[PDB]
Design a protein around this ligand. Structure first.
Ligand SMILES: O=C(Nc1ccc2nc(CN3CCCCC3)[nH]c2c1)c1ccc(I)cc1
Length: 141
């Protein structure tokens, strides 16, 4: 009997692209998954998959190690599935977030957003519990 809690931060940045009028992409953006400072989520994260809009080349973007990030240019926001796969041998094996990748329209300042997610692992295996604690996970009883 125990629960281990770990924290993820999903986020994105967006700003106007400074390029020729005849390049269609208006924005640079960057989406990520990280841990809090002094935490190392690589201990329990196998990989992160960012599912870009179907219009992008190779829209299924995989980061098997940090940084878990995609940097791109684009002309519109979209809803981005983000799967965080665990180094877990049992359920759950991953978690899927639906990430709102919005751009700064109408000459608004750059976007810099953070979404903080708490994961609660109930009764993890010995092995996976150690990975979570190595990453800076916290136990409860
Ligand atoms: O920006 C979009 N599409 C898009 C489509 C193709 C793109 N290629 C680049 C540029 N890249 C290519 C790969 C290497 C890095 C630069 N950037 C792209 C952006 C988009 C289309 C519809 C909707 I609703 C929402 C977003």
């Amino acid at each position: 009997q125990c629960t281990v809690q770990v924290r993820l931060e999903l986020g994105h940045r967006a700003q106007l692209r400074k390029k020729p009028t005849t390049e269609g992409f208006t924005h640079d953006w960057m989406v990520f998954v990280r841990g809090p400072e002094q935490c190392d989520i690589q201990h329990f994260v196998e990989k992160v998959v960012f599912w870009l809009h179907d219009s992008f080349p190779k829209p299924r973007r995989v980061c098997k190690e940090p940084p878990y990030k995609v940097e791109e240019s684009g002309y519109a926001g979209f809803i981005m599935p983000i799967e965080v796969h665990f180094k877990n041998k049992e359920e759950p094996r991953k978690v899927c977030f639906t990430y709102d990748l919005f751009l700064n329209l109408e000459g608004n300042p750059p976007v810099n957003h953070l979404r903080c997610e708490k994961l609660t692992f109930n009764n993890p295996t010995t092995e996976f519990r150690y990975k979570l604690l190595r990453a800076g996970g916290v136990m409860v009883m």
